[PDB]
């Protein structure tokens, strides 16, 4: 027995594809071995996204895995919820109840606001980028209205790379006029690193300036260049490198070569690749549970084409969705439990601060609890 699936990896996700392969070979069980068909493309081009989607749909697959941006999430959700096709993705969640989508990246607004109100903040800033959405921004604004805050929102995505230095320096210069020393950074690795570069240039890495990285790869970025500025730097983490299974995976990972497994001969791993690993795990577990449910869902014939008018769903797809949304395991990120829509639940988000002795966890967060303090 075998299975046909699809992989939508953007040009440049070498580490993510490496982790995908590592998981496919680790969880490989002769009882049922999967057979994917990768398709790399510009993920921000809905045209190519739909091309690959229809290719993998006609290929006769049951589930699809891949990323998406704020320019293709709508396309993906529509196509999936129409053709009743499960789509797994670590990319940012969706601002709605989009079915047939398995969002592995947990939420962040909760822990972010918890940390904020824990540091007792009332006037700060928020530098955002539209590369992921504006749900965090909307949550921040509503919490400010309900908390009597004074936010200073700014966008740093439309700013090209040719005038970045001049612009950023201008923003940091005209920011001190309001005596604003505390700051937030809702951007990806590239943007946060460019911003830290501009910061070290202006020399604002001195103490009194607090910084929050509103992502999960607090350890993936270049940090040692500002760890000595005495600044109040913080950040979140989703992977805990000090656990049994994650440490074993890291041992098996760093010892790999950068030729047959690019972006894999390191001690740290991107949370995106960790979630790709966990996604391989959960897909294997769901298909195994189906195999153990005394059910065969082999497509009767060719699945068809996207443009089939009218639509042409198949209930066994709903069964696959229900199976995927009924999993509970422990992966690199931790307890992986889902809800009826697809979002994650009952997860852990380790908080981290940058101290002279390196990053140090100072507690965790969850949905049932508020922020916790562990480091005495």
Ligand X SMILES: *[C@@H]1O[C@H](CO)[C@@H](O[C@@H]2O[C@H](CO)[C@@H](O[C@@H]3O[C@H](CO)[C@@H](O)[C@H](O)[C@@H]3O)[C@H](O)[C@H]2NC(C)=O)[C@H](O)[C@H]1NC(C)=O
Ligand Y SMILES: *[C@@H]1O[C@H](CO)[C@@H](O[C@@H]2O[C@H](CO)[C@@H](O)[C@H](O)[C@H]2NC(C)=O)[C@H](O)[C@H]1NC(C)=O
Positions that interact with a second copy (CB under 8 A): 45-47, 50-51, 54, 70-72, 74-75, 77-79, 82, 95, 130, 134, 138, 141-142, 145-146, 150, 152-155, 158, 169, 174, 200-203, 205-207, 225, 228-231, 305-307, 309, 311
Question: Which residue, 174 or 339, is less far from a second copy as judged by CB?
Answer: 174
* Closest C-alpha to 113, from 296, 313, 370: 370
x/- letters, 192..211, toward ligand Y (CB under 6 A)? --------------------
- Considering CB distances under 5 to 8 angstroms, the limit depending on partner class, which of a second copy, ligand X, ligand Y, none binds residue 71? a second copy
Q: How far is the CB of 287 from ligand Y (least distance, A)?
A: 21
Q: Which of 315, 339, 314, 341 is nearest to 327 (CA)?
A: 339
To ligand Y, the closest distance from the beta carbon of 335 in angstroms equals 3
**What Å distances lie between residue 251 and 72, 246, 248, 264, 315, CA to CA?**
36, 9, 5, 11, 42
- Out of ligand X, a second copy, ligand Y, none, what residue 330 binds, judged by CB under 5 to 8 A for its kind, is ligand Y
Cβ closer to ligand Y: 26 or 328? 328
Binding partner at 181 among ligand X, ligand Y, a second copy, none, C-beta below 5 to 8 Å by kind? ligand X
State the binding partner of 169 from ligand Y, ligand X, a second copy, none, CB within 5 to 8 A by kind.
a second copy
DSSP H stretches of helix in 206-314: 244-254, 271-291
Which of ligand X, ligand Y, a second copy, none binds 232 (CB below 5-8 Å, type-dependent)?
ligand X
Whether 167 and 190 have beta carbons less than 8 Å apart is answered as no
Report the Cα–Cα distance between both ends of the chain, in Å, rounded.
53
Q: What is the DSSP letter of 256?
A: S
Which one, 84 or 204, has the nearer CB to ligand X?
204
**C-beta of 210 vs 299, nearer to ligand X:** 210
Beta carbons of 245 and 376 less than 8 angstroms apart: no
Q: Closer to ligand X at the Cβ: 79 or 209?
A: 209
Q: Among 57, 138, 64, which residue's Cα sits nearest to residue 96?
A: 138
Nearer to a second copy, 164 or 169 (CB): 169
Q: How far is the CB of 321 from ligand Y (least distance, A)?
A: 21
> CB 330 → ligand Y: shortest distance, Å?
4
Q: Is 304 left (phi over 0), alpha (psi -120 to 50) or beta?
A: left
Strand spans (E) along the chain:
2-8, 33-38, 63-66, 86-89, 101-103, 126-128, 153-155, 182-186, 210-213, 232-237, 328-330, 335-338, 344-345, 350-355, 358-363
Strand partners, 158: none
As a whole number of angstroms, the distance between CA 30 and CA 66 comes to 25
Judged by beta carbon distances under 5 to 8 A according to partner kind, the member of ligand X, ligand Y, a second copy, none in contact with residue 346 is ligand Y
Looking at residues 317 to 336 of the shown chain, list those that interact with ligand Y (rule: CB under 6 A).
328, 330, 335
Q: Which residues contact 310 (CB under 8 A, 6 or more apart)?
A: none
Residue 185's DSSP bridge partners are 127, 213
219 versus 234: smaller Cβ distance to ligand X: 234
Query: Which entry of ligand Y, ligand X, a second copy, none binds 210, CB below 5 to 8 A by partner kind?
Result: ligand X
Residue 62: CB minimum distance to a second copy, A: 19
Examine residue 40 and tell whether it contacts ligand Y (CB under 6 A): no
Q: Which of ligand X, ligand Y, a second copy, none does residue 208 bind (CB under 5 to 8 Å by kind)?
A: ligand X
Nearer to a second copy, 82 or 316 (CB): 82
CA distance linking residue 268 with residue 272, whole number of Å = 12
Residue nearest to ligand Y (CB): 335
Contact 34, 24 (CB under 8 A): yes
What does the alpha-carbon distance between residue 3 and residue 298 come to, in Å, rounded to a whole number? 9
Please, which residue, 276 or 333, has the CB nearer to ligand Y? Answer: 333
Residues that bind ligand Y (CB under 6 A): 328, 330, 335, 346
């Amino acid at each position: 027995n075998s299975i046909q699936i699809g992989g939508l990896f953007p040009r440049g996700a070498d580490q993510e594809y490496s982790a995908f392969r590592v998981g496919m070979v680790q969880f490989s069980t002769s009882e049922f071995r999967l057979t994917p068909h990768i398709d790399n493309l510009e993920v921000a081009n809905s045209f190519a996204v739909t091309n690959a989607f229809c290719s993998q749909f006609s290929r006769g697959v049951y589930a699809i895995f891949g990323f998406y941006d704020k320019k293709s999430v709508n396309t993906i959700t529509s196509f999936c919820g129409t053709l009743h096709v499960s789509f797994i993705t670590p990319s940012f969640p969706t601002d709605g109840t989009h079915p047939f989508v398995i969002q592995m990246r947990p939420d962040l607004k909760g822990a972010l606001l918890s940390l904020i109100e824990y540091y007792q903040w009332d006037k700060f800033a928020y530098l955002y980028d539209s590369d992921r959405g504006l749900s965090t921004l909307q949550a921040v604004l509503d919490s400010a209205a309900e908390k009597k805050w004074q936010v200073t929102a700014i966008n740093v995505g439309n700013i090209n790379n040719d005038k970045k230095d001049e612009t950023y320096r201008s923003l940091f210069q005209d920011l001190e006029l309001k005596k604003e020393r505390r700051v937030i950074l809702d951007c990806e690795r590239d943007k946060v690193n460019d911003i830290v570069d501009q910061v070290i240039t202006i020399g604002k890495h001195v103490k009194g300036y607090h910084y929050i990285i509103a992502n999960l790869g607090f350890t993936d970025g270049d940090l040692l260049k500002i760890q000595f500025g005495g600044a109040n730097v913080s950040g979140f983490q989703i992977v805990d490198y000090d656990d049994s299974l994650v440490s074993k995976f890291i041992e098996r990972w760093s010892t790999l070569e950068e030729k047959e497994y690019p972006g894999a001969h390191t001690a740290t791993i991107k949370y995106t690749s960790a979630l790709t690993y966990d996604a391989v795990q959960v897909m294997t577990e769901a298909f195994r549970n189906l195999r153990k449910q005394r059910i065969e869902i082999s497509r009767r014939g060719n699945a068809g084409d996207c443009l089939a008018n009218p639509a042409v769903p198949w209930g066994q797809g709903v069964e696959i969705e229900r199976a995927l949304k009924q999993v509970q395991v422990e992966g690199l990120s931790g307890n992986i439990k889902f809800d009826q829509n697809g979002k994650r639940i009952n997860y852990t988000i380790n908080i981290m601060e940058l101290k002279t002795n390196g990053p140090r966890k100072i507690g965790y967060w969850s949905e049932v609890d508020k922020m916790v303090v562990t480091l005495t």
